Paper text:
Since the two structures are virtually identical (root-mean-square deviation [rmsd] of 0.23 Å for aligned Cα atoms), we will hereafter describe the ENPP6–phosphocholine complex structure, unless otherwise stated. Although electron densities of four glycans linked to Asn100, Asn118, Asn341 and Asn404 are observed in the apo form, the electron density of the Asn100-linked glycan was not observed in the complex, probably due to the flexibility of the Asn100-linked glycan. As observed in the structures of ENPP1, ENPP2 and ENPP4, two zinc ions are coordinated by conserved active-site residues.
The ecto-nucleotide pyrophosphatases/phosphodiesterases (ENPPs or NPPs) family consists of seven structurally-related ecto-enzymes. In addition, we showed that ENPP6-deficient mice have impaired myelin structure and are prone to having a fatty liver, which are typical symptoms of choline deficiency. Together, these results strongly suggest that ENPP6 serves as a choline-supplying enzyme.
Numbering used by the authors: 24 to 415
The structure:
C-alpha cells in the first residue's frame, strides 16, 4: 500500500479548529473521512530541522542528535547552519539515527522526496530514489505540482513512499504573525490543493491503494520586537564566547576556556529567559544528552527573542532594497506551550474515518508511517498505545 506524506511547516494546531474548519473544505473533508488528532506535540526545541528528524525517526532529539537548526562541533570546528552552508551536507550531522526513508531504501523500496530537507544528503551511505532538492521557498504552484507528480510516481510504482515539504504557512506566520490574513491566505491555498488532491486520487483510481498522512513540525506564536528582545552584548562580552549558534528562543553558547562560570552567572540574572548548564537542562525536553548540545543553552520565555544585538535580528526582505522587515511570529520555545502544537491527520484504507484521535507526540508518528508502509520500525521512543486506536 502506497504512502504519501505531507509536511506542512509551521502549521499550528488551532489553524484547523472547528471555527476555522467552517471555511476550509479541503481539511474538513479529510477530518470528516479520516483521522485528526487533537494536536501533535513537537519535540524540544520546537524548531524545524530537529523536529523533521524526530518525525522521521520516532526518536527524541537527544537520540537522533539533530538538536538545533544551527549546530557546532568543537572537535572538527564545523557547523550546520540551517542546511545552507556546504558543511550541512556532512554525514556528521545526520548519522545519529536512521530516518524512515533510508530504512525504506535499504529494504529495496522506492522513495520520492519533494523539497524535503535532508533528501539531498547521503545518510548512513544511502540516498532516496528521487530528491527534488529544497533551494528556495516552494510556491503554492510548486506544492500542487509536487502533489500531482507524487501521485503519479506512487501509482506507477516508481515510488512506494512519496514525501512532500511545504514551507509557506511557516513563512507567512513568521512575516505577519500566526493570526494574520497573510497566514490565513497561505493556509487557504493549501486547503485548495488538498481538494485537488482528493479529486486527483479519485481521478487516478488510487483510493484503495493509498494512505495520506499530513503533519507539521511545530506551531507558531506572536513575537514582540523591539520590546521583547534580549541582547546578549548588554550583559557579556561576545569576545568571551568561542561560539554562538542561532537567534531566537533557543540559543547555544560555548564560553571561551575559563569563562564558563562567569558567563553563566552573568546571564542567570537576565529576566524573560532561562540559562541552562547542559547537565541541568530539564529532563522532560529529552534534549540534554545530545552530543552537540552546547555547554550553556538559552531558552527565552514565550514571545521573547534572544540575539547578540538588535542589529543581528533576522530581518526579512519585504522591500528588495535591504532586509528591513520585522518578524511578527516565531517558534522554538518550550514544546509544551499551546502555541507550539502542530497537527496530525491521516486518511486512507488503513485509517478510521471521522475519528477524533487523542493528541500524540512527534516521536509517535514514525510507528504509524512504518506500519502502513509495511516496514518494521527501528526501535524508537514513540508510543504504540498512544496511536493504535486510529488504525482500521
Ligand atoms: C517593510 O518593512 C518596514 C519595516 O517596518 C515594519 O516591518 C513590517 C514587516 C511590519 O511588521 C511593520 O509593523 C514593521 O514596523 C516597513 O517600514 C514601516 O512602515 C510603516 C508604514 O506602513 C511605518 O508605520 C513603520 O514605522 C515603518 N517601520 C520602520 C522600522 O521604518 C515598510 O513599510 C515595509 N514595506 C515596504 C518597505 O514596502
Ligand atoms: C529512545 O529510544 C532509543 C531506542 O533506540 C533508546 O536508545 C537505545 O537504548 C538501548 C537500551 O535501552 C541501547 O542499547 C541503545 O544503544 C540505544 N540506542 C541509541 C541510538 O541511543 C533510548 O533510550 C530512548 N530514550 C528514552 C528517553 O526512552
Ligand atoms: C574554527 O575556524 C575558524 C574559521 O572558520 C577559525 O577562525 C577558528 O580559529 C577555528 N577554531 C578552532 C578551535 O580551530
Ligand atoms: C555516519 O557519519 C559519520 C560521520 O562522518 C561516520 O563516521 C560514519 O561512518 C557514518 N556511518 C555510515 C553507516 O555511513
Ligand atoms: Zn518548521
Ligand atoms: Zn519557522
Amino acid at each position: 500500500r502506497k504512502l504519501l506524506v505531507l509536511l506542512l511547516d509551521g502549521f499550528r494546531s488551532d489553524y484547523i479548529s472547528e471555527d476555522a474548519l467552517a471555511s476550509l473544505p479541503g481539511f474538513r473533508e479529510i477530518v470528516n473521512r479520516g483521522v485528526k488528532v487533537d494536536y501533535l506535540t513537537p519535540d524540544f526545541p520546537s524548531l524545524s530541522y530537529p523536529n523533521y528528524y524526530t518525525l522521521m525517526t520516532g526518536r527524541h532529539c537527544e537520540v537522533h542528535q539533530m538538536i538545533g537548526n544551527y549546530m557546532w562541533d568543537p572537535r572538527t570546528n564545523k557547523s550546520f547552519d540551517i542546511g545552507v552552508n556546504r558543511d550541512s551536507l556532512m554525514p556528521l550531522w545526520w548519522n545519529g539515527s536512521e530516518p524512515l526513508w533510508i530504512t525504506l531504501m535499504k529494504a529495496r523500496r522506492k522513495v520520492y522526496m519533494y523539497y524535503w530537507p535532508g533528501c539531498e544528503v547521503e545518510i548512513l551511505g544511502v540516498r532516496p530514489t528521487y530528491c527534488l532538492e529544497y533551494k528556495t521557498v516552494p510556491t503554492d504552484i510548486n506544492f500542487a505540482n509536487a502533489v500531482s507528480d507524487a501521485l503519479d510516481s506512487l501509482k506507477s510504482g516508481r515510488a512506494d513512499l512519496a514525501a512532500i515539504y511545504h514551507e509557506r504557512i511557516d513563512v507567512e506566520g513568521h512575516h505577519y504573525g500566526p493570526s494574520s490574513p497573510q497566514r490565513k491566505d497561505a493556509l487557504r491555498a493549501v486547503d485548495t490543493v488538498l481538494k485537488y488532491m482528493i479529486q486527483w486520487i479519485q481521478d487516478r483510481g488510487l483510493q484503495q491503494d493509498l494512505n495520506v498522512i499530513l503533519f507539521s513540525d511545530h506551531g507558531m506564536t506572536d513575537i514582540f520586537w523591539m520590546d521583547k528582545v534580549i541582547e546578549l552584548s548588554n550583559y557579556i562580552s561576545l569576545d568571551d564566547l568561542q561560539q554562538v549558534k542561532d537567534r531566537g528562543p533557543v540559543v547555544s553558547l560555548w564560553p571561551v576556556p575559563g569563562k564558563h562560570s562567569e558567563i553563566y552567572h552573568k546571564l542567570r540574572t537576565v529576566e524573560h529567559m532561562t540559562v541552562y548548564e547542559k547537565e541541568s537542562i530539564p529532563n522532560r525536553f529529552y534534549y540534554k544528552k545530545g552530543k552537540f548540545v552546547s555547554p550553556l543553552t538559552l531558552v527565552a520565555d514565550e514571545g521573547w527573542f534572544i540575539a547578540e544585538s538588535r542589529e543581528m535580528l533576522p530581518f526579512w526582505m519585504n522591500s528588495t532594497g535591504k532586509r528591513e522587515g520585522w518578524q511578527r511570529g516565531w517558534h522554538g520555545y518550550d514544546n509544551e506551550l499551546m502555541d507550539m502544537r502542530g497537527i496530525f491527520l491521516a486518511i486512507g484504507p488503513d485509517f478510521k474515518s471521522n475519528f477524533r484521535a487523542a493528541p500524540i507526540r512527534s516521536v509517535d508518528v514514525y510507528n504509524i508511517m512504518a506500519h502502513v508502509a509495511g516496514i518494521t520500525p527501528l526501535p524508537n521512543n514513540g508510543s504504540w498505545s498512544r496511536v493504535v486506536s486510529m488504525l482500521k
